[PDB]
């Protein structure tokens, strides 16, 4: 019987047309993204899309193997293999688009890098489907069989390049976030030490304590600036400045408070507002981290309230220092 024996071949032709459209669709998105109009969906951290990309990417690796294995054999099995791969790349493209958009319109250079990485996969799939067609029901020795295997590696090479780009993107997207977190743990360790019953390394004068307190002023303002700019470089600088400023203020506070010439109520008062200041400040940094994950106007206005809470303790801290003489 003349059962249709070019359906596999036919599926390859239809697949090639589909892949052409996806690439054209990714070029369009690169255009929008380059112009800065591919906006973030409020929050929707990159960490979410990363899983969907990776999951779909592993499915695409299986579809690659199925294509290679099924080029020799049934037309129907080849037709099925072609169709499956096109469905997967459609989905992979779409989830990568969402991941790139989740980086936000203020980082357009990285958005385009990400979309191109998946575009490269799309191109490699087109070549792979073309190679299976040329190899459709050919046996091992045939150069088309050689070419099919070679086409499939140039596909998986692209897939791993996509995965490498995703890893590089996410590290850069959180380098400041992860630095600020390191600072909050250091501050907590410092504050646990500050609050511990062990004495400070030495005593000091109100003037040493006072000069550290003023450091809080410059750091709070800086932190507020990083939360408003959301620039990872400002976040890095805030992390470094905040760690030193709070650590220093806690050291001098306890050293000044334990000075023999300080009355027990004034020592008590100084220690209390030292803790208060650090705690208010940790809540400010924690609000900064929330702002970095969903940088809308609402969260940023709330930075004002946190800055006031730190400032309120600073006033107490300065009056406590003066009362040590």
């Amino acid at each position: 019987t003349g059962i249709d024996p070019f359906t596999g071949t036919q599926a390859c032709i239809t697949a090639a047309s589909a892949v052409s459209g996806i690439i054209a669709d990714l070029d369009t998105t690169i255009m929008f993204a380059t112009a800065g109009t591919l906006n973030r969906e409020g929050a929707e951290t990159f960490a979410d899309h990363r899983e969907g990309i990776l999951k779909t990417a592993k499915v695409l690796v299986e579809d690659t193997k199925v294509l290679v294995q099924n080029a020799a054999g049934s037309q129907e099995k080849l037709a099925q293999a072609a169709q499956s791969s096109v469905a997967t790349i459609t989905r992979l493209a779409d989830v990568v688009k969402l991941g790139a958009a989740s980086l936000g319109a203020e980082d357009p250079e990285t958005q385009v890098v990400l979309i191109n990485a998946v575009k490269d996969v799309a191109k490699a799939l087109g070549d792979l489907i073309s190679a299976t067609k040329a190899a459709a029901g050919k046996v091992g020795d045939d150069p088309a069989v050689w070419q099919l295997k070679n086409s499939a590696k140039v596909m998986v090479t692209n897939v791993t390049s996509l995965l490498k780009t995703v890893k590089a993107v996410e590290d850069e997207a959180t380098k400041g976030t992860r630095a600020l977190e390191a600072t909050t743990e250091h501050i907590r360790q410092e504050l646990a030490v500050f609050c511990s019953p062990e004495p400070p390394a030495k005593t000091s004068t109100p003037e040493d304590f006072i000069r550290m307190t003023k450091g809080i002023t410059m750091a709070t303002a800086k932190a507020v600036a990083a939360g408003n700019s959301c620039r990872q470089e400002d976040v890095i600088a805030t992390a470094n400045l905040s760690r030193r400023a709070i650590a220093d203020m806690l050291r001098a506070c306890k050293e000044a408070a334990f000075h023999p010439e300080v009355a027990p109520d004034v020592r008590l008062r100084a220690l209390h507002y030292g803790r208060e200041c650090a705690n208010g400040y940790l809540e400010l940094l924690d609000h900064v981290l929330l702002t970095l994950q969903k940088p809308n106007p609402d969260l940023k206005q709330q930075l004002t309230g946190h800055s006031k809470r730190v400032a309120g303790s600073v006033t107490e801290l300065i009056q406590a220092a003066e009362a040590m003489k």
Binding site: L54, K58, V61, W146, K149, A152, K153, V156, T160, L163
Partner: peptide, 24 residues
Amino acid sequence: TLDIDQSIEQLNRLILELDPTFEP
């Protein structure tokens, strides 16, 4: 389950499986 650190390992080996110039 596998994360990107291990996937990129299995896939670099898979690139060599497919690679028809590479046959030890």
